[PDB]
């Protein structure tokens, strides 16, 4: 059974945090993957993007580890990417799933043009970078689909982006940097200050302040 | 470096006659059979997602 180790975990387990958006609003670190399992555990789908063997030379031969890149996310605005290196492939994949759950970020979705219906594309052009790989996401008309390489396409579909134009520069052959760059571009959607986000922010009690006595009695 | 051996392996390969089998469906029927084999039949699946021509 889940025994929370952090204050956030204890608050989540006792139904005091009503949504994952309350954690994102205060930008609290999520150190327990069981929080994500609680909030989204029925709709998350994880995909092993890659298993990559890495070798360290020693006095006698190469010690080999396997690095699992795993993309996770429900297809309605949440996505994460996790990389874990371990001696065995299975435990590397287990750790990568855990790390992808821990790194799940919200995805802001917008409209290319007229604003009928649910948001379908990125709110604006956003670029993400990782180690000489630059991935640019551009809003696309409804029904376009993801015009991208397979690796960014996986993460964009997992994030609930229905249609998006993609540009990529650099050594995209290195799947890890490509995936990290598109994850960065996706996570920059909610950091972009658009004029609808100009309204002054109304501050709310943080979960640690709101449910303080609950944690005090614990 | 000699041209004396030019059809060696194909020449010495034992000859096996092709077996007689019923004709393969063509056109729309073949696509119907493929669709049924891939999306209406689930018994071959065992959870491993093995290939369609697996031999082990």
């Amino acid at each position: 059974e889940w025994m929370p180790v952090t204050k956030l975990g204890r608050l989540v387990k006792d139904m005091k945090i009503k949504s994952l958006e309350e954690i994102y609003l205060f930008s609290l670190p999520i150190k327990e993957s069981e929080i994500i399992d609680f909030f989204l555990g029925a709709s998350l789908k994880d995909e092993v993007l890659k298993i990559m063997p890495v070798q360290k030379q020693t006095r006698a031969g190469q010690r080999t580890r396997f690095k699992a890149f795993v993309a996770i996310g429900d297809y309605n605005g949440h996505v994460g990417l996790g990389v874990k290196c371990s001696k065995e492939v299975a435990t590397a994949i287990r750790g990568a799933i855990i790390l992808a759950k821990l790194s799940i970020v919200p995805v802001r979705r917008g409209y290319w043009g007229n604003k009928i219906g649910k948001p379908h594309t990125v709110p604006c052009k956003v670029t993400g970078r990782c180690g000489s790989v630059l991935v640019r996401l551009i809003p696309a008309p409804r029904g376009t689909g993801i015009v991208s390489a397979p690796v960014p396409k996986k993460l964009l579909m997992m994030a609930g982006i229905d249609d998006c134009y993609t540009s990529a520069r650099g050594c995209t052959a290195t799947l890890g940097n490509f995936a990290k760059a598109t994850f960065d571009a996706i996570s920059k959607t909610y950091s972009y200050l658009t004029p609808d986000l100009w309204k002054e922010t109304v501050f709310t009690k943080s979960p640690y302040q709101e449910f303080t006595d609950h944690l005090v009695k614990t | 470096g000699s041209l004396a051996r030019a059809g060696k392996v194909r020449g010495q390969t034992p000859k096996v006659a092709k077996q007689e089998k019923k004709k393969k469906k063509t056109g729309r029927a073949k696509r119907r059979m493929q669709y049924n084999r891939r999306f209406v039949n689930v018994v071959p699946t065992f959870g491993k997602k093995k290939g369609p021509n697996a031999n082990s």
């Binding site: 995909e47 092993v48 298993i51 396997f66 065995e88 994949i93 | 699946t45 491993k48 997602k49 082990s56």
Partner: peptide, 30 residues
């Protein structure tokens, strides 16, 4: 035969690509 095991052993051999493909088949898809 477990394809995770086959990939662990034979990834650097002549059949590295094949065991990688089999591992990817098992990992995602069901």
């Amino acid at each position: 035969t477990d394809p995770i095991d086959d990939f662990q052993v034979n990834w650097n051999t002549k059949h590295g690509s094949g065991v990688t493909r089999e591992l990817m088949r098992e990992l995602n898809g069901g």
